[PDB]
Amino acid sequence: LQNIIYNPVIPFVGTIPDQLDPGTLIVIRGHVPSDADRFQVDLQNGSSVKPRADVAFHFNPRFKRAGCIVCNTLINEKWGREEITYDTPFKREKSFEIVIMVLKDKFQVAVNGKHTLLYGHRIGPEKIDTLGIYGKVNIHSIGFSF
Numbered sequence: 001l002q003n004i005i006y007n008p009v010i011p012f013v014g015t016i017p018d019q020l021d022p023g024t025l026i027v028i029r030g031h032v033p034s035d036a037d038r039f040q041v042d043l044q045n046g047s048s049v050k051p052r053a054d055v056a057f058h059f060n061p062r063f064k065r066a067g068c069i070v071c072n073t074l075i076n077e078k079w080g081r082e083e084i085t086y087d088t089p090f091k092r093e094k095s096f097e098i099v100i101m102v103l104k105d106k107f108q109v110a111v112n113g114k115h116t117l118l119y120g121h122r123i124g125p126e127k128i129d130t131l132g133i134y135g136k137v138n139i140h141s142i143g144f145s146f
């Protein structure tokens with residue numbers, strides 16, 4: 001892996017070091033703290049806060065009750081239609097590895113070595129230049145393969 005970021009402070013907002021062409025991997029290794037209610041990994045168009053930057057792909061594990069992963073897109077400061085995956089691998093106090101693979105038509109995401117979900121593109125992935133990680137999460141490394 002390339003352009004590896006170690007132990008970033010959260011919230012993390014960083015420029016992705018190359019375009020997200022088909023076959024690109026984003027690999028994120030981390031841990032969920034015991035007090036976590038949710039965290040998110042956002043692939044964004046820029047880093048503006050006011051107005052809020054468009055989020056092509058919001059990947060949002062939530063830990064209340066049996067948990068879930070909520071995926072969505074933010075356009076013009078407005079959330080679209082949620083795609084919720086209830087078969088969630090994440091747990092409070094457990095370590096994880098997320099692999100986001102960018103394909104022509106969709107994102108393909110594996111967690112802890114097992115296929116987890118697909119998310120069809122809503123914003124062209126060529127519009128993505130920024131990776132954001134927010135919420136209650138401990139990140140050990142972020143790595144890229146272009």
Ligand SMILES: *O[C@H]1[C@@H](O)[C@@H](CO)O[C@@H](O[C@H]2[C@H](O)[C@@H](O)[C@H](O)O[C@@H]2CO)[C@@H]1O
Nearest residue numbers: 040058060070071072073079080081082
């Ligand atoms: O932070 C926001 C983000 O996670 C979006 C993703 O769609 O969800 C927002 O919360 C939703 C919530 O998921 C839904 O159940 C409720 O009816 O609407 C909320 C506001 O859009 C998060 O605020």
